[PDB]
Design a protein around this ligand. Structure first.
Ligand SMILES: CS(=O)(=O)c1ccc(Br)cc1CC(=O)N1CCC[C@H](C(N)=O)C1
Ligand SMILES: [Zn+2]
Length: 139
């Protein structure tokens, strides 16, 4: 579980969004597994605007942060689940690192700020849904 709080926005995995998130919906994209809802309180997370391919992510199944090299956002095939049929997830980045069900929502950060959140994984890999192209989160 986990979310990004920037300005008047909350960014969470779309498959884990709550009733409040859907009642206060700003934007959602099932192909990216992302949903953004509005908040009354102000958020101070900084979003990175870069093309970093290294960073650090939070892994809740280990209560630890790990450094990773990750790929550029692209379309990657993702297996069926209680949340989605089999499909290509877009804007997804892969890294070699530990992740297991329950880890979605962990933040990936580089020196510039928040890069994305855990969205997929398994087999010694971890997948992150990128948020660096959503320029409107800041303004
Ligand atoms: C594939 S797994 O070994 O069950 C796993 C491992 C790590 C992590 Br983080 C998570 C899982 C499950 C997984 O990737 N899901 C379920 C939730 C929605 C995801 C999606 N973006 O379509 C796909
Ligand atoms: Zn960066």
């Amino acid at each position: 579980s986990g979310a990004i709080y920037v300005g008047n926005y909350r960014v969470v995995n779309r498959h884990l969004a709550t009733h409040n998130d859907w009642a206060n919906l700003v934007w959602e994209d099932s192909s990216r597994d992302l949903l953004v809802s509005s908040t009354t309180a102000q958020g101070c997370d900084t979003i990175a605007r870069c093309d970093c391919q290294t960073g650090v992510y939070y892994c809740s199944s280990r209560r630890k942060h790990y450094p990773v090299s990750f790929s550029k956002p692209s379309l990657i095939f993702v297996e069926a689940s209680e949340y989605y049929p089999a499909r290509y997830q877009s804007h997804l980045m892969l890294a070699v690192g530990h992740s297991e069900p329950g880890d979605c929502g962990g933040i990936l950060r580089c020196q510039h700020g928040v890069v994305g959140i855990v969205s997929t994984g398994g087999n010694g890999l971890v997948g992150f849904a990128d948020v660096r192209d959503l320029l409107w989160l800041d303004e």
